[PDB]
């Protein structure tokens, strides 16, 4: 099963490898490793994905773009969002969720391991 | 029959980002509708607010994205509106210091998708341009 992570570029760099190294143990993450070719090259990660994995804590406009076009893929998607942080996580984002194909999990640092254990379980 | 405009931009830039943004949605108003002119941006169930969006998304004939600031929803719009094969022009000041993400910068294709640089005093004239 390929997994597609992503995050803002905005700090908790420590936080997303734990994701991504927590990820690697379900399948094979595409992301783990001019702004046409990015884009052309996000936008077939997320196409070849099983599961779109997106941190969301951090506002990102990448993240969102990402996400939408993840949705019109129909893909299967999990936000994690910290809510220690501050900050609020937009409706846009929070509102999408149905509880099935497109899930938006509340998380502390300590439970990220756990929480994707029982995800994928 | 008027075209009907969509316009979004993110809720943490300040306050001299609202007077802009009602400045460039009063520009708007003189070419068409303005799906989004009432939403109190300020000030910003969540469902309800995801369903509406996707519906003024939807009946829009042109997206218009003010992306100097980050934000999640403004992203999710415009990777929504790609997929519904909207027209948009994204907005974009590079006096504010930020480099724009290359997810965004990086759909454009000078066509149906276009990112325009632009300063404040020049909106209104860069606005008369695309919608002329
Ligand atoms: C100002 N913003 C931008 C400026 C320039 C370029 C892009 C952006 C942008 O909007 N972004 C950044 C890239 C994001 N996408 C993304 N992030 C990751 C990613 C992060 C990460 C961290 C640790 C490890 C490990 N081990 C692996 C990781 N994999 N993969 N992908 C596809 C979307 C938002
Ligand atoms: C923390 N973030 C959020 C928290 C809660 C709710 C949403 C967000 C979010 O992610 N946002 C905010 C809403 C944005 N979308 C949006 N903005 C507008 C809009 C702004 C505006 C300004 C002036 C005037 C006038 N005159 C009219 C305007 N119309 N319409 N729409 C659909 C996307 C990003
Ligand atoms: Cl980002
Ligand atoms: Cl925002």
Redesign the pocket.
């Given at each position: 099963p390929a997994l597609?992570?992503?995050?803002?570029?905005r700090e908790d760099?420590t936080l997303?490898?734990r994701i991504?190294?927590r990820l690697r143990r379900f399948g094979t993450v595409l992301?783990?490793h001019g702004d046409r070719l990015?884009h052309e090259q996000?936008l077939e990660?997320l196409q070849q994905a099983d599961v779109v994995v997106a941190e969301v804590t951090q506002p990102?406009?990448?993240?969102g773009y990402?996400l939408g076009r993840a949705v019109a893929f129909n893909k299967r998607i999990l936000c994690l969002f910290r809510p220690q942080s501050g900050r609020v996580l937009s409706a846009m984002i929070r509102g999408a969720a149905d509880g099935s194909r497109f899930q938006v999990w509340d998380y502390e640092e300590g439970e990220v391991e756990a929480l994707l254990d029982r995800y994928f379980e």
């Open positions: 597609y992570f992503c995050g803002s570029i760099r997303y490898e991504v190294s992301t783990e990015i996000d990660w990102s406009l990448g993240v990402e």
